[PDB]
Design a protein around this ligand. Sequence first.
Ligand code: FES
Length: 56
Amino acid sequence: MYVCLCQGVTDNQIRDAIYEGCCSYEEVREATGVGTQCGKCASLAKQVVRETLNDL
Ligand code: FES
């Protein structure tokens, strides 16, 4: 699904950003743009980050 409609970032793209090097929402934000516009998706994006890290 789209986590961030403003930037067109999917849950899979957040996971892949982590697999590819990111360790934090802040890094995923800079790498993908998630949460940089209205910011309403930040909590959901942080949930995806937390879930992905816990699964590693
Ligand atoms: S929905 Fe992600 S910044 Fe607006």
